[PDB]
């Protein structure tokens, strides 16, 4: 799923050095991105959406239940007229991407946080350089407005989601020559108000300066689409305890890269449950975070973990692997990882996995382990006392693995909270109704706005008409659509047309055809008694 | 004598996206007001003055010239037929005049009608369209003054 955000604002009317405006260059770049992505044999399941800088009823051009034909037709007729309302457009796009999330089961907020339930989405937000306006002045903060929150959105406290990356294109093409071609293989950043918003999600922001640089950035962007598993790392709290082959001193601490969870839907178990201590009676649930604040500690702690535990291959995208490569990729050794923010009743973090590398030393495998592996792996009334340290709802998925061996547990203590189940079906129904109402009025514009609003300065109610583009005057049916110049000739033409008594008469003077004239479409409505047997 | 009924579709003729239809409607209403004097005629004339005043700020120079060249004698006849409209018309004229005062000073000209402010009317060729519009406004104001004074 790819949602292209093209502003089509009035500031996108300035002409480049090639002769076309920035909007035409953006549309051409989108078309070349389409034809480049079509090369990879994986573009048979994705869906394209379009978002412009227009009113909430008119911002979306093609959303759910819209094929490629209507999407291309809407992107073709894009007009650059309006202000640069970036915040409202980003909010509308994020709400559109989060319409079918509370109904299928993604981010249920009650049963862990399953990383194998993915809904990838990439935003391009092709906008102008700077100087965004909000009908009052020029702002320099880019704060997303919060006026009408969706039902069930206060449990994340952030507009974007687990898998929602945000790339940006500014299209800073000069007007005279664009002769800046010193650095060949180098794509700098835009350094604008959208740069922090993009970096928070996990995607960079390109700075287009030349058509060659545009082609380079488009060819570099097609290689950044996969399953979205974005997790945040922190150096705390080990004081860079990497004393293995050298001495530490770094910027590879707050790594917020993605992870490629390739399927073999995705197959996996043992998710990151949450970051708080869930109580048995809690009417209000604390809001989750889109990026989990999980921290790693550099300790050997028996990296050899061999068992019949179901295996996972959530591949990690190499972005800050320099710190690992400095220590020879940690051969035959790993380092634990633990989620912060009160992972248990009374403690600060519980190691639930590690980041052991592969034998090929190519990337990090991201070995996800159970909540507390070094205890259950090595019954004398031990498991009954051990199952009290883990979160309650967490007994859900692990028991499935126990199904591979037997079934000692039951549904006696399989209860998260009596108040968490309530006020959940109503929120899901409200979200479904909102998604249906949004998908219903998605393409039907029905503007019907043509007036001059004649002010005084039949009274207080007059309004002069405006020039209608698609008027289609009926010359043979309506007599008012016949001007004075070609009146007598048109009169004789109408007379001859009425006195001819032909078959299948029409009221159009000369209606040649539409913009498209297909050969197969016209040849299908015919009959040819021939087969060419010879 | 059956022309008064045309008033019943004079406003409908004004609300048209074509400037020629609006100009013809304004001229026809001007002639109907200089011929017939009725309260309905006064209301339609006031509506025409309003829609002409609101069209000054939504038309370009090339269209403003072509729309305000024929429609000034209409204002002259409106003043001749309806005294209470005088002020309004004057105000309107002033506005239009000031607009022309900003159109001539924009681009260089050949006659420079700005210094011609201290000139008098003399009883009774190819030039600039803005200068022609200024001269037409001045002439129509002169005719309105001569009609009201005499």
From Swiss-Prot, chain A:
The GO cellular component terms are:
actin cytoskeleton; chromatin; INTAC complex; integrator complex; nucleoplasm; nucleus
Species for this entry: Homo sapiens (Human)
Q: Does the keyword Nucleus apply?
A: yes
Q: Name one GO biological process term.
A: snRNA processing
Induction (record text): Frequently down-regulated in nonsmall cell lung carcinomas and prostate cancers. Down-regulation in prostate cancer is due to CpG hypermethylation of its promoter. However, some involvement in cancer is unclear.
Identify its protein family.
Answer: Belongs to the Integrator subunit 6 family.
Q: What is its main location?
A: nucleus
The gene is INTS6
Q: In which tissues is it expressed?
A: Widely expressed. Expressed in heart, brain, placenta, lung, liver, skeletal muscle, kidney and pancreas.
Protein name from the UniProt record? Integrator complex subunit 6
This molecule's function is given as: Component of the integrator complex, a multiprotein complex that terminates RNA polymerase II (Pol II) transcription in the promoter-proximal region of genes.
Q: How does it assemble?
A: Component of the Integrator complex, composed of core subunits INTS1, INTS2, INTS3, INTS4, INTS5, INTS6, INTS7, INTS8, INTS9/RC74, INTS10, INTS11/CPSF3L, INTS12, INTS13, INTS14 and INTS15. The core complex associates with protein phosphatase 2A subunits PPP2CA and PPP2R1A, to form the Integrator-PP2A (INTAC) complex.
Q: Where in this chain does the record put each VWFA domain?
A: 1-225
Q: Where in the cell is it found?
A: Nucleus; Chromosome
Please provide the record's keywords in A-Z order.
Chromosome, Nucleus, Phosphoprotein
The molecular function terms of the Gene Ontology recorded here are: protein-macromolecule adaptor activity; transmembrane signaling receptor activity
Which top-rank group of organisms is this from?
Eukaryota
**SS bond partners:** none
Curated annotation (Swiss-Prot), chain B:
> What is the name of this protein?
Integrator complex subunit 2
Q: Which gene name belongs to this protein?
A: INTS2
Subunit structure, as described in the record: Component of the Integrator complex, composed of core subunits INTS1, INTS2, INTS3, INTS4, INTS5, INTS6, INTS7, INTS8, INTS9/RC74, INTS10, INTS11/CPSF3L, INTS12, INTS13, INTS14 and INTS15. The core complex associates with protein phosphatase 2A subunits PPP2CA and PPP2R1A, to form the Integrator-PP2A (INTAC) complex.
Q: What's the family?
A: Belongs to the Integrator subunit 2 family.
Top-rank taxon of the source lineage equals: Eukaryota
Cell location = Nucleus; Nucleus membrane; Cytoplasm
Which purpose does this protein serve, as stated in its record?
Component of the integrator complex, a multiprotein complex that terminates RNA polymerase II (Pol II) transcription in the promoter-proximal region of genes.
């Amino acid at each position: 799923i790819l949602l292209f955000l093209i502003d089509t604002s009035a500031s996108m009317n300035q002409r480049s050095h090639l002769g076309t405006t920035y909007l035409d260059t953006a549309k051409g770049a989108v078309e070349t991105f389409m034809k480049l992505r079509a090369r990879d044999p994986a573009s048979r399941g994705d869906r394209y959406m379009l978002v412009t800088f227009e009113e909430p009823p008119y911002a979306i051009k093609a959303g759910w239940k819209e094929n490629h034909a209507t999407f291309m037709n809407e992107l073709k007729n894009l007009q650059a007229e309006g202000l640069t309302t970036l915040g409202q457009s980003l909010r509308t796009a994020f709400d559109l991407l989060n319409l079918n999330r509370l109904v299928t089961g993604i981010d249920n907020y009650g049963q862990g946080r399953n990383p194998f339930f993915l809904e990838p989405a990439i935003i391009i937000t092709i906008t102008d350089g700077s100087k965004l306006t909000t009908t009052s002045g020029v702002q320099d903060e880019l704060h997303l407005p919060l006026n009408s929150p969706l039902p069930g959105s206060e449990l994340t406290k952030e507009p974007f989601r687990w898998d929602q990356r945000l790339f940006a294109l500014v299209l800073r093409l000069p007007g005279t020559m664009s002769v800046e071609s010193e650095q060949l293989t180098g794509v700098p950043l835009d350094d604008s108000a959208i740069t922090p918003m993009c970096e928070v999600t996990g995607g960079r922001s390109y700075s287009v300066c030349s058509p060659r640089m545009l082609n380079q950035c488009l060819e570099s962007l097609v290689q950044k689409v996969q399953s979205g598993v974005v997790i945040n790392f922190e150096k705390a709290g080990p004081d860079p305890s990497p004393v293995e082959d050298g001495q530490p001193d770094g910027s590879q601490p707050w790594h917020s890269c993605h992870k490629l969870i390739y399927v073999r839907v995705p197959i996996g178990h043992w998710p990151v449950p949450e970051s708080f201590w869930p109580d048995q009676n809690s009417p209000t649930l604390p809001p989750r975070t889109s990026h989990p604040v999980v921290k790693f500690s550099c300790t050997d702690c028996e990296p050899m973990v061999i068992d019949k535990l179901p295996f996972d291959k959530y591949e990690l995208e190499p972005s800050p692997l320099t710190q690992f490569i400095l220590e020879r990729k940690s051969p035959q050794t790993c380092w634990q990882v633990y989620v912060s923010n009160s992972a248990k009743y009374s403690e600060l973090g519980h190691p639930f996995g590690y980041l052991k590398a592969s034998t090929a030393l190519n990337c990090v495998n991201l070995f996800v382990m159970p909540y507390n592996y070094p205890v259950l792996l090595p019954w004398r009334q031990s498991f009954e006392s051990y199952l009290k340290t883990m979160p309650p709802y967490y007994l859900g998925p692990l028991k499935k693995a126990v199904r591979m061996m037997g079934a000692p547990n039951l549904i006696a203590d399989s209860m998260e909270y009596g108040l968490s189940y309530s006020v959940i079906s109503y929120l899901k129904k409200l979200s479904q109704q909102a998604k249906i109402e949004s998908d219903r009025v998605i393409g039907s514009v029905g503007k019907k706005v043509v007036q001059e609003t004649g002010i005084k300065v039949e009274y207080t109610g007059f309004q002069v008409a405006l020039l209608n583009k698609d008027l289609k005057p009926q010359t043979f049916r309506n007599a008012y659509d016949i001007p004075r110049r070609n009146l007598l000739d048109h009169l004789t033409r109408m007379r001859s047309n009425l006195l001819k008594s032909t078959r299948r008469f029409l009221k159009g003077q000369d209606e040649d055809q539409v913009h498209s004239v297909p050969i197969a479409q016209m040849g299908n409505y015919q009959e040819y008694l021939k087969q060419v047997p010879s | 004598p059956s022309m008064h009924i045309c008033l019943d579709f004079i406003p409908e003729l004004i609300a048209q996206p074509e400037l020629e239809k609006q100009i013809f409607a304004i001229q026809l209403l001007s002639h109907l007001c200089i011929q017939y004097a009725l309260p309905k005629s006064l209301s339609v004339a006031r509506l025409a003055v309003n829609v002409m005043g609101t069209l000054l700020t939504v038309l370009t120079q090339a269209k403003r010239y072509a729309f305000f060249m024929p429609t000034l004698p209409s204002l002259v006849s409106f003043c001749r037929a309806f005294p209470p409209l005088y002020e309004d018309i004057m105000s309107l004229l002033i506005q239009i005049g000031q607009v022309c005062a900003s159109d001539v000073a924009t681009q260089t000209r050949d006659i420079d009608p700005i210094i011609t402010r201290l000139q008098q009317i003399k009883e009774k060729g190819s030039m600039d369209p803005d200068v022609q519009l200024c001269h037409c406004i001045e002439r129509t104001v002169i005719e309105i003054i001569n009609m009201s004074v005499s």
